[PDB]
Design an enzyme around this catalytic site. Structure first.
Site, PDB file in Angstrom:
ATOM      1  N   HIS A 173       0.953  -1.348   0.027  1.00 52.85           N
ATOM      2  CA  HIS A 173      -0.179  -0.291  -0.485  1.00 52.85           C
ATOM      3  C   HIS A 173       1.008   1.191  -0.275  1.00 52.85           C
ATOM      4  CE1 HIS A 173      -3.172  -2.994   1.181  1.00 52.85           C
ATOM      5  NE2 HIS A 173      -3.858  -2.314   0.021  1.00 52.85           N
TER       6      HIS A 173
ATOM      7  N   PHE B 288      -8.258 -16.255  -3.437  1.00 53.95           N
ATOM      8  CA  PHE B 288      -8.990 -14.541  -4.743  1.00 53.95           C
ATOM      9  C   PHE B 288      -9.074 -14.134  -5.626  1.00 53.95           C
ATOM     10  CE2 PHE B 288      -6.323 -10.008  -5.081  1.00 53.95           C
ATOM     11  CZ  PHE B 288      -6.953  -9.895  -4.633  1.00 53.95           C
TER      12      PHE B 288
HETATM   13  C1  LIG Z   1      -2.404  -9.392  -5.197  1.00 54.93           C
HETATM   14  O1  LIG Z   1      -2.970 -10.270  -4.213  1.00 54.93           O
HETATM   15  C2  LIG Z   1      -3.560  -9.379  -3.947  1.00 54.93           C
HETATM   16  C3  LIG Z   1      -3.941  -7.827  -3.447  1.00 54.93           C
HETATM   17  C4  LIG Z   1      -4.402  -7.167  -2.943  1.00 54.93           C
HETATM   18  C5  LIG Z   1      -5.638  -7.965  -1.485  1.00 54.93           C
HETATM   19  C6  LIG Z   1      -6.725  -7.606  -1.318  1.00 54.93           C
HETATM   20  N1  LIG Z   1      -7.081  -7.899  -0.301  1.00 54.93           N
HETATM   21  N2  LIG Z   1      -8.247  -7.521   0.942  1.00 54.93           N
HETATM   22  C7  LIG Z   1      -8.716  -8.420   1.144  1.00 54.93           C
HETATM   23  C8  LIG Z   1      -9.402  -9.769   0.383  1.00 54.93           C
HETATM   24  C9  LIG Z   1     -10.785 -10.256   1.170  1.00 54.93           C
HETATM   25  C10 LIG Z   1     -10.168 -11.635   1.665  1.00 54.93           C
HETATM   26  C11 LIG Z   1      -9.641 -11.061   2.871  1.00 54.93           C
HETATM   27  C12 LIG Z   1      -7.635 -10.334   2.107  1.00 54.93           C
HETATM   28  C13 LIG Z   1      -8.321  -9.164   2.668  1.00 54.93           C
HETATM   29  C14 LIG Z   1      -7.944  -6.396   0.609  1.00 54.93           C
HETATM   30  O2  LIG Z   1      -8.204  -5.373   1.142  1.00 54.93           O
HETATM   31  C15 LIG Z   1      -6.525  -6.100  -0.818  1.00 54.93           C
HETATM   32  C16 LIG Z   1      -5.929  -4.958   0.006  1.00 54.93           C
HETATM   33  C17 LIG Z   1      -7.809  -5.335  -2.014  1.00 54.93           C
HETATM   34  C18 LIG Z   1      -5.224  -9.622  -1.449  1.00 54.93           C
HETATM   35  C19 LIG Z   1      -4.348 -10.287  -2.521  1.00 54.93           C
HETATM   36  O3  LIG Z   1      -4.117 -11.990  -2.645  1.00 54.93           O
HETATM   37  C20 LIG Z   1      -3.842 -11.964  -1.283  1.00 54.93           C
HETATM   38  C21 LIG Z   1      -4.401 -13.525  -1.076  1.00 54.93           C
HETATM   39  C22 LIG Z   1      -6.121 -13.068  -0.525  1.00 54.93           C
HETATM   40  C23 LIG Z   1      -7.369 -13.890  -0.427  1.00 54.93           C
HETATM   41  O4  LIG Z   1      -8.494 -13.165  -0.334  1.00 54.93           O
HETATM   42  C24 LIG Z   1      -9.187 -14.205  -0.250  1.00 54.93           C
HETATM   43  C25 LIG Z   1     -10.513 -14.119  -0.894  1.00 54.93           C
HETATM   44  C26 LIG Z   1     -11.717 -15.345  -0.594  1.00 54.93           C
HETATM   45  C27 LIG Z   1     -11.967 -16.260  -0.483  1.00 54.93           C
HETATM   46  C28 LIG Z   1     -12.500 -17.174  -0.185  1.00 54.93           C
HETATM   47  N3  LIG Z   1     -13.700 -16.926   0.227  1.00 54.93           N
HETATM   48  N4  LIG Z   1     -14.858 -18.254   0.183  1.00 54.93           N
HETATM   49  N5  LIG Z   1     -13.758 -19.103  -0.235  1.00 54.93           N
HETATM   50  N6  LIG Z   1     -12.497 -18.346  -0.250  1.00 54.93           N
HETATM   51  C29 LIG Z   1     -10.135 -16.736  -0.351  1.00 54.93           C
HETATM   52  C30 LIG Z   1      -9.148 -15.802  -0.042  1.00 54.93           C
HETATM   53 MG   LIG Z   2      -7.262   1.087   0.301  1.00 55.46          MG
HETATM   54 ZN   LIG Z   3      -5.857   0.271  -2.975  1.00 53.75          ZN
END
Ligand SMILES: COc1ccc(C2=NN(C3CCCCCC3)C(=O)C2(C)C)cc1OCCCCOc1ccc(-c2nnn[nH]2)cc1
Ligand SMILES: [Mg+2]
Ligand SMILES: [Zn+2]
Ligand SMILES: [Mg+2]
EC number: 3.1.4.53
Length: 330
Positions: free
Chosen positions: A79, A291
């Site tokens: 960030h 994700f």
């Molecule tokens: C280049 O990579 C990434 C860039 C940004 C993120 C972010 N992430 N987030 C939040 C997103 C919501 C999930 C929590 C993280 C925080 C931001 O605020 C941001 C900062 C947008 C993340 C990046 O990748 C990292 C892997 C996260 C895995 O995200 C998920 C989601 C959903 C399920 C799922 N659902 N149902 N079953 N499984 C699994 C895994």
């Molecule tokens: Mg933000």
């Molecule tokens: Zn951002």
């Protein structure tokens, strides 16, 4: 000379890719001396003729941009000013899509680009929930509500008040009130707590889609216009997995450094370690596939439907990247 330096020339050549998905944004960060947000914003403002349209003094623009860039933290892995520059440039490419040609006003375009530039300013590299759970001053100031996103807005706007930083000094009060409302609506929509409602509304809009003068979206009310801009900047914020893999993997390394540092601070304080923040219980690859499957692909598939066939190559890159990460899971 009155001619650029050799490093300024190499930078200008990289910035010829500013209208392309997959700009070498890390190379621009290196070549600009850690000024990717300033040089990318200045390039985009010149390309879209925003200085003339909004009577922005060029010295004021550059002063504000350097000030804004300086309020991003170089000691936060994800960030930071490079992420801000990347979201700006990705928004700029999405605004140029065939399906949106002549849809948005110059003020809406300025709102989307300015919102993108400020959307993470002064990010401490920890989540809203971490700030709430630690009784941080930011969480108390915003009553635990979109804590970071409220802060990014307040800082982005407050910096306009520094010496020779008011880039909106020649806008009418009507222009400024409209711009300010749109920028607030867009940055507040970057809070991931809003993702499922934004996506629901974008899907409703695709289901009831109207096109006018052949092929261009019809958006005849503020609710629909601001919803498309909110989803557009949200797509830009969630664009990392849609980029060429050499870029995507640098973004993954950075987000996981930031997440693991938060998890280290949670573990050392006896807190529950947040999802994907435990470096001892991590699958970087499974986390990227989750994700993409649960957040990024549902959003980009819906965006692709709204602007169909404009985003087909972006969706194909996303699908290829997802298969690549899946193929690396032990
Ligand atoms: C280049 O990579 C990434 C860039 C940004 C993120 C972010 N992430 N987030 C939040 C997103 C919501 C999930 C929590 C993280 C925080 C931001 O605020 C941001 C900062 C947008 C993340 C990046 O990748 C990292 C892997 C996260 C895995 O995200 C998920 C989601 C959903 C399920 C799922 N659902 N149902 N079953 N499984 C699994 C895994
Ligand atoms: Mg933000
Ligand atoms: Zn951002
Ligand atoms: Mg710092």
């Amino acid at each position: 000379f009155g001619v650029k330096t050799e490093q300024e020339d190499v930078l200008a050549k990289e910035l010829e890719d500013v209208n392309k998905w997959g700009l070498h944004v890390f190379r621009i960060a290196e070549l600009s001396g850690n000024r990717p947000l300033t040089v990318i914003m200045h390039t985009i403002f010149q390309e879209r003729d925003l200085l003339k349209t909004f009577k922005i003094p060029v010295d004021t623009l550059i002063t504000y941009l350097m000030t804004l860039e300086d309020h991003y933290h170089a000691d936060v892995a994800y960030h930071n000013n490079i992420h801000a520059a990347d979201v700006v440039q990705s928004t700029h490419v999405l605004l140029s899509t065939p399906a949106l040609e002549a849809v948005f006003t110059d003020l809406e375009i300025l709102a989307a680009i300015f919102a993108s530039a400020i959307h993470d300013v002064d990010h401490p590299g920890v989540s809203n929930q971490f700030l709430i759970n630690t009784n941080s001053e930011l969480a108390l100031m915003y009553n635990d509500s979109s804590v970071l996103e409220n802060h990014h807005l307040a800082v982005g706007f407050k910096l306009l008040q520094e010496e020779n930083c008011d880039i909106f000094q020649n806008l009418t009060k009507k222009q400024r009130q409209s711009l300010r409302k749109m920028v607030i609506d867009i940055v507040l929509a970057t809070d991931m707590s809003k993702h499922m409602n934004l996506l629901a509304d974008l899907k409703t809009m695709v289901e009831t889609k109207k096109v006018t003068s052949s092929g261009v979206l019809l958006l005849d009310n503020y609710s629909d216009r601001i919803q498309v801009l909110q989803n557009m900047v949200h797509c830009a914020d969630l664009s990392n997995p849609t980029k060429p893999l050499q870029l995507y993997r640098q973004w993954t390394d950075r987000i996981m450094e930031e997440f693991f540092r938060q998890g280290d601070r949670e573990r050392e304080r006896g807190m529950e370690i947040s999802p994907m923040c435990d470096k001892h219980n991590a699958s970087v690859e499974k986390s990227q596939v989750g994700f993409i499957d649960y957040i990024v692909h549902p959003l980009w598939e819906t965006w692709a439907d709204l602007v169909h066939p404009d985003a087909q190559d972006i969706l194909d890159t996303l699908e290829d990247n997802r298969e690549w990460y899946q193929s690396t899971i032990p």
